[PDB]
């Protein structure tokens, strides 16, 4: 039983350039529980990132929220980078404010 993570990267509030907000990376559906999650700004790892306490769903798969404050701009790229035993290479999902 190895299940690969599903990833959603999004903001806590509807995003406006220049107004502070919170960047979220929600990882769910995975097993076993060890997982590496980074939030990236312009390809580089953000360093004060916090996360929720591990919990799990009906089918026993795990989920976690990773989050940090950020200020969206026209210029900066944000993304979530996930590695797990089920993945060959780390998976990078770019933040899109429409999703």
């Amino acid at each position: 039983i190895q299940r690969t993570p599903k990833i959603q990267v999004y903001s806590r509030h509807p995003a406006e350039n220049g107004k502070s907000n919170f960047l979220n990376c929600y990882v769910s559906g995975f097993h076993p529980s060890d997982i590496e999650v980074d939030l990236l700004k312009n390809g580089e790892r953000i360093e004060k990132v916090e996360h929720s306490d591990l919990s799990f769903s009906k089918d026993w798969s795990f989920y976690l929220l990773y989050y940090t404050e950020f200020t969206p701009t026209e210029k900066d790229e944000y993304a979530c980078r996930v590695n797990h035993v089920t993945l060959s290479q780390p998976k990078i999902v770019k933040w899109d404010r429409d999703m």
């Binding site: 039983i1 299940r3 599903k6 959603q8 999004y10 806590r12 509807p14 919170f22 979220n24 929600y26 769910s28 097993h31 076993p32 529980s33 060890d34 929720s52 306490d53 591990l54 919990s55 799990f56 026993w60 798969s61 795990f62 929220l65 989050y67 429409d98 999703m99």
Partner: protein, 278 residues
Amino acid sequence: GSHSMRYFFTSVSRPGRGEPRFIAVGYVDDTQFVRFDSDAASQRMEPRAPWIEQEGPEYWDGETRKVKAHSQTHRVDLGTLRGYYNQSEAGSHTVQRMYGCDVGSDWRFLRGYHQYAYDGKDYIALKEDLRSWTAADMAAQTTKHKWEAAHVAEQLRAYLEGTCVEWLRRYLENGKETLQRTDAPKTHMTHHAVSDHEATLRCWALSFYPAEITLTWQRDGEDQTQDTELVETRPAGDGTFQKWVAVVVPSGQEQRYTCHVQHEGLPKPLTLRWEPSS
């Protein structure tokens, strides 16, 4: 409405060195209110909601003793199941446990549950009668015979129908200002061209509580599933939840499509339509 109290426990063995990693969380409905983490400095059950901080030191002492006892049970089980399954001492394995109770709108007991998993699969679970056990395989059958001999289901039933529901009602009263408040979805629709003659319509539900919600698309008032996409409900990070649904439509035909939102905080279901200005 109806309410629930649930505790979740995860233990992960560390064959290389030391004791398993153990994490425990308690919820009322979709609100986390206590946690324990074996890697944290305090080694105590800790509050995670304002209304539980009311409880006195005898509460926090008792809960810390019980959660550490749970952690030792998991440690022992990890060793026992490794033997049942003839597994190496070199690998890491996981045990998970969840239990809790539901009450109806009258706050009376509706159902209880107590379930256990090994390496992410069903192992043993109390049946809905709270008297007997579902064992998934012959290893769990061995555990079932031990728990029948030791009256385990009787003690769990007493807790689930008694203590569990009594303290749930206590928490619902003390935390009334949030736990009994419903937050209806704040809804809006966005429009994203995908070509000069098709567009995505995306229906958003934001900042709602509890997490249960239904979002559905209709075209000329019939259900629509073709060319739709629905993301899993996700936490906002401030205690509320988010969801969206989307459909691809021919440009110029947006008024045919309606998004319908059902949630406990809405007296009547909501209907949204694209407003031809953005």
